[PDB]
Amino acid sequence: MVLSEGEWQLVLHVWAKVEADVAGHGQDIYIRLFKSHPETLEKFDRFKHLKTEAEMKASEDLKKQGVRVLTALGAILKKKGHHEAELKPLAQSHATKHKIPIKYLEFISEAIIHVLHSRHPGNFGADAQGAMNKALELFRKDIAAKYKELGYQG
Ligand code: HEM
């Protein structure tokens, strides 16, 4: 699949707003992910002990992790589809070390869309959401392909 320049513009326009507060968006996304799909928390040995949203918001380590995640995703989105190099290390670690199924990548994609919709309604109308969904679907499609090459069914 391929996004048009117009669709990429919608994606990068709202992403520019996210970048005004990377740490805050990361926390919101994780909290949404862990509350909606608790099973995903079990994959994080360093955070699986967190019991409440309050503890999650107070975790300095979780905040730092969120920044790393959004920074990596932002770098990929900014490549506008030409992300082969960026995807390699990410696919290898998540398939071989962390063992993250594609289903969980779908769950975090849902959390990202939920948070953007909540925080940036003016820059996340129907067309913008459609573009972001398309960008995330492309990301998941390419990661899934790499997973297969690496020997992980995902
Ligand atoms: C938006 C998609 C995602 C991106 C861009 C992303 C990115 C990253 C990055 C950059 C790291 C640090 C370096 C590395 O180990 O590769 C990382 C670590 C990790 N990721 Fe992800 N990730 C994503 C989704 C997920 C999901 C959905 C899960 C599981 C529910 C997950 C589980 C982990 C774990 C367990 C670690 C290691 C954390 C630690 O060091 O304690 N990731 N991720």
Side-chain angles (χ1 to χ4, degrees), residues 8 11-19 22 25 29 65-83 86-87 90 112 116 132 135-136 139:
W8 280 120
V11 170
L12 296 175
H13 184 255
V14 67
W15 196 257
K17 305 307 176 187
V18 173
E19 291 187 325
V22 175
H25 283 79
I29 289 166
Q65 188 58 45
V67 170
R68 299 169 188 172
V69 174
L70 289 187
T71 298
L73 179 59
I76 286 170
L77 295 177
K78 290 176 185 179
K79 294 304 297 297
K80 302 166 70 174
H82 300 277
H83 54 225
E86 290 70 25
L87 242 53
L90 189 58
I112 290 171
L116 299 182
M132 180 60 75
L136 293 176
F139 165 70

Side-chain angles (χ1 to χ4, degrees), residues 17 44-45 56 67 70 72 84 108 112 118 122 134:
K17 305 307 176 187
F44 296 84
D45 298 306
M56 289 173 203
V67 170
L70 289 187
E84 171 73 328
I108 199 171
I112 290 171
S118 178
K134 199 173 178 182

Side-chain angles (χ1 to χ4, degrees), residues 30 33-34 40-41 43-47 65 68-70 72-73 76 89-90 93-94 97-98 100 104-105 108 112 139:
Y30 268 139
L33 175 66
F34 299 146
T40 59
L41 181 58
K43 287 292 182 180
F44 296 84
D45 298 306
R46 288 198 303 160
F47 311 119
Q65 188 58 45
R68 299 169 188 172
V69 174
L70 289 187
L73 179 59
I76 286 170
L90 189 58
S93 66
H94 288 60
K97 185 182 295 67
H98 316 314
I100 309 307
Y104 287 10
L105 294 181
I108 199 171
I112 290 171
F139 165 70

